[PDB]
């Protein structure tokens, strides 16, 4: 009594009001922007969906007793919304269900009444006009049954409900809604379904069936137009291609669909991370590092989002092969716990010439390296150490006898030194030249001058940028 | 002083890292411990140091006698005198808290000061209490404590009473010197040399001058170094008594490099034995060596390393290896040769320098306007 009766008053008040008014305002705005301003892409619909994704999902995992959030289904289960009294009475029913739940015990679902709270919800003269509301209130029950964090008696229901919602949205878009483009929401739905499939493929077989379904799903897109649809499906599919079945790489290399220019910024980071991974695994290193750094600064601004850790654990190896990382710059407070234990010991061994310590660290942390799915290091990093030494020699000296590098890089012979330096110059790490006569290695000509035709080539790019920005800005000014 | 002696802190450091040096310092460290009956700290140190000697009984009984005498005095005062604020009870518990700081651990003393700070209304007493907190925090290098109370003093109080504040323009810098960061700050605020409390303000004058010289030679080399330190008769007075330091300065200024390295070896050796400076000895030696190398490399454009082999020290291969190490790291702005031993210096023309600066400052700003425009507009 002291823990259940006394803690009952505090809980009931907040979910009774704040969540209900939240979904009320969101539905009102959705109805307003679907009725007027058919170009309703720019609205609070996306902000509402993001807030529901961020805030409402985490506030609860259990079935929300005392009819606070489980009661919404028995509220909207009978909705007509044909004329003014029908919509008014459906809102009144919502209010009355909230009042009853705050006064007495309202309708409860015992892990099996959600289908009647879902079948009857689409029954009782339900309104198609709020198709987005149907989708939202059908997907929200997924996350509770998904984020129940139990994975018992809810994953199967999750899969069935997901299939129901997918079928509903496919039949809805079969009519090709006019001046509405519900896809702006559908995408999230799609992602959500993939979620449970992963959960399904975490509780059962992988997402190959999902793979076929989503090939069909992007095929039904890309035809009319694209509105944030394909931009999600592509990275979902190449996520599954690389999801513990990553051994498949050959194909996606021929995924030649253009990636849409105007996309949600958060997704561009996923796209560039996966492009970097695929580029680096097949041994191209010039483009990989630059595009991955472009990815990192694209959308990192958050309090420890989490995958920045992984991109760092990749950019360190992918640029270890070519030079030096900021040795102490990036080991700060978030990543410090992980990155430091293996990667720091590595780069420290790499700058030094200690092969035995390299083997020691490899033996110690190979399990962690394989767990991260980045075991390329032994494959190439162990046998490409001498490249760094050649780079250093390039930076310091400008005229040296190749008979000296052998004692400087412990090669013990001049001829194989000639071979390795020639290979390095052909690879383009250094542009020196060799006198094949008397053990003479010379640098290229001095830097000619920094103001002949190489500068203005950059200022042209910057003008293109600046004038483009000004035009983009001036166009979309004051719609009404 | 409020703290019994920062000297004792220096001593404990001088005895901690070297076990071999557990002979000379302890000889008077034990005397300083037994005197004043500041017993509470040394027990653990004695667990770390030499084993034990039976004196805890008498030290405990005398500390307890003083404790109870002071407590009875203060309670009788609070029962007979009924004034608050800056009244007699306040100073009685000042005596108690000061005795705790002098003798015991920091927790009880700091709690006493916490319970007495709200009692005051006079700003001078608040400044005195924050000074007590600064001294006790700097005694054990409790970083967050001093970071909080320095801001407390410098913001909440420093708008009324003045000139009793120059006692603090030398403590900001004690902190900025114990941590490697910002030698520039300490150099530019140890600029004043009218020090006040000779030993109540921690270290003695002469040590203060050696510290200002030591830091200053880094933050500014020959951008009017002379008009600040060479023309400073006030420090020329005291360094006239110390030959080593004046030899060091005038060896670097007059371009006499061999004696300069001798002196720097001496300075590095003695800086090893310190408390505030010991962590950064090895950032000093390296950032001085490189300054001298670039100072001589200027005024030449094609030098022969056989010339530095003598005009700067000895050991052709030695300067070879050092030049290699420093050039690779992006410093000692030049290039090298090996077949005929001719170090050639390259230096960007002004125009190239300005072009290189703009090419990055601009695109950095462009990236920020890019992100701004992307967040706005949906």
């Amino acid at each position: 009594p002291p823990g259940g009766g006394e803690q009952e008053p505090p809980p009931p008040p907040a979910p009774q009001d704040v969540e209900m008014k939240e979904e009320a305002a969101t539905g009102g705005g959705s109805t307003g922007e679907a009725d007027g301003k058919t170009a309703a892409a720019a609205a609070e619909h996306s902000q509402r969906e993001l807030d529901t994704v961020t805030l409402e999902d985490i506030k609860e995992h259990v079935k929300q007793l005392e009819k606070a959030v489980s009661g919404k289904e028995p509220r909207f289960v009978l909705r007509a919304l044909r004329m003014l009294p029908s919509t008014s009475r459906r809102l009144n029913h919502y209010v009355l269900y909230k009042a009853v739940q705050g006064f007495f015990t309202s309708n409860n679902a015992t892990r099996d009444f959600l289908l009647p709270f879902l079948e009857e919800p689409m029954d009782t003269e339900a309104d198609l006009q709020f198709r987005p509301r149907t989708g939202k209130a059908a997907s929200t029950p997924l996350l509770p049954e998904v984020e129940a964090y139990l994975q018992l008696l809810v994953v199967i229901f999750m899969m069935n409900s997901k299939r129901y919602k997918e079928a509903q949205k496919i039949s809805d878009d079969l009519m090709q809604k006019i001046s509405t483009q519900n896809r702006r929401a559908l995408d999230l739905v799609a992602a959500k379904c993939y979620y449970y499939h992963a959960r399904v493929y975490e509780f059962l077989d992988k997402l190959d069936v999902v793979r076929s379904f989503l090939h069909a799903r992007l095929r039904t897109a890309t035809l009319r137009h694209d509105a944030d649809g394909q931009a999600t499906l592509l990275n979902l599919l190449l996520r599954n291609y690389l999801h513990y079945s990553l051994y498949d790489q050959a194909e996606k290399l021929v995924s030649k669909s253009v990636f849409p220019e105007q996309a949600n910024n958060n997704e561009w980071a996923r796209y560039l991370y996966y492009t970097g991974r695929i580029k680096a695994i097949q041994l191209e290193y010039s483009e990989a590092r630059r595009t991955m750094t472009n990815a990192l600064r694209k959308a990192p601004q958050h309090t420890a989002v989490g995958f920045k850790q992984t991109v760092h654990k990749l950019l360190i190896v992918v640029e270890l092969l070519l030079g030096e990382i900021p040795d102490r710059l990036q080991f700060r407070q978030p990543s410090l716990k992980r990155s430091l234990m293996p990667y720091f010991l590595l780069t420290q061994a790499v700058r030094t010439g200690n092969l035995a310590k390299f083997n020691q660290v490899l033996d110690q942390f190979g399990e962690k390296f394989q767990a991260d799915g980045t075991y390329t290091l032994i494959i190439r990093l162990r046998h490409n150490v001498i490249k760094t030494g050649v780079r250093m020699i390039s930076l310091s000296y400008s005229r040296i006898s190749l008979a000296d590098i052998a004692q400087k890089l412990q090669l013990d012979s001049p001829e194989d030194a000639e071979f390795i330096v020639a290979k390095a110059i052909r690879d383009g790490v250094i542009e020196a030249s060799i006198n094949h006569e008397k053990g003479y290695v010379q640098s290229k000509e001095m830097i000619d001058i920094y103001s002949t035709r190489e500068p203005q080539l950059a200022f042209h790019q910057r003008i293109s940028f600046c004038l483009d920005i000004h035009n983009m800005s001036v166009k979309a000014m004051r719609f009404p | 002083p409020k703290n019994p002696d920062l000297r004792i802190a220096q001593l404990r450091f001088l005895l901690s890292l070297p076990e071999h040096r557990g002979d000379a310092a302890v000889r008077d460290e034990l005397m300083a411990a037994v005197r004043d009956n500041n017993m509470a700290p040394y027990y653990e140190a004695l667990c770390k140091s030499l084993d034990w000697q039976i004196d805890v009984d008498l030290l405990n009984k005398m500390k307890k006698a003083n404790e109870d005498e002071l407590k009875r005095l203060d309670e009788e005062l609070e029962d007979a005198e009924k004034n608050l604020g800056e009244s007699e009870i306040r100073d009685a518990m000042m005596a108690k808290a000061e005795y705790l700081c002098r003798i015991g651990d920091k927790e009880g003393a700091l709690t006493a000061f916490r319970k007495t700070y709200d009692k005051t209304v006079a700003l001078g007493h608040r400044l005195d209490i924050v000074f007590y907190l600064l001294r006790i925090g700097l005694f054990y290098m409790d970083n967050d404590l001093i970071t909080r109370n320095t801001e407390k003093a410098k913001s909440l109080i420093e708008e009324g009473g003045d000139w009793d504040r120059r006692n603090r323009l030398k403590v900001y810098q004690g902190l900025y010197c114990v941590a490697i960061r910002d030698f520039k700050q300490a150099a530019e605020l140890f600029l004043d040399t009218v020090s006040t409390f000779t030993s109540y303000e921690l270290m003695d004058y002469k040590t203060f001058v050696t510290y200002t010289v030591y830091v200053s030679m880094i933050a500014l080399e020959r951008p009017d170094l002379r008009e600040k330190v060479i023309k400073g008769a006030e420090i020329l007075e005291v360094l006239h008594s110390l030959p080593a330091v004046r030899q060091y300065l005038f060896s670097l200024y007059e371009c006499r490099y061999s004696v300069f390295f001798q002196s720097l070896a001496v300075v590095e050796q003695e800086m090893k034995k310190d408390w505030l400076f010991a962590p950064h000895y090895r950032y000093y030696v390296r950032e001085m060596r490189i300054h001298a190398y670039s100072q001589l490399l200027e005024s030449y454009r094609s030098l022969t390393l056989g010339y530095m082999a003598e005009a700067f020290g000895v050991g052709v291969e030695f300067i070879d290896q050092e030049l290699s190490r420093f050039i690779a790291a992006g410093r000692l702005h030049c290039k090298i040769d090996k077949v005929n031993e001719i170090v050639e210096t390259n230096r960007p023309d002004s125009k190239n320098w300005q072009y290189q600066e703009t090419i990055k400052k601009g695109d950095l700003l462009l990236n920020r306007v890019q992100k701004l425009s992307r967040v706005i507009n949906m």
């Binding site: 200022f459 910057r462 003008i463 600046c466 004038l467 920005i469 000004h470 800005s473 001036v474 979309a476 000014m477 004051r478 719609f479 009404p480 | 703009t358 601009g362 700003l365 462009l366 306007v369 701004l372 425009s373 706005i376 507009n377």
Partner: peptide, 30 residues
């Protein structure tokens, strides 16, 4: 590089003010 730039920053400033004012005038009537 020094005349285009201060021609874009002005345009962003004007856009920010416009969106602020238009949305404010919208919610004021709602």
């Amino acid at each position: 590089y020094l005349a285009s730039l201060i021609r874009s920053v002005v345009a962003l400033h004007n856009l920010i003010n416009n969106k602020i004012a238009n949305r404010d005038a919208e919610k004021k009537e709602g």
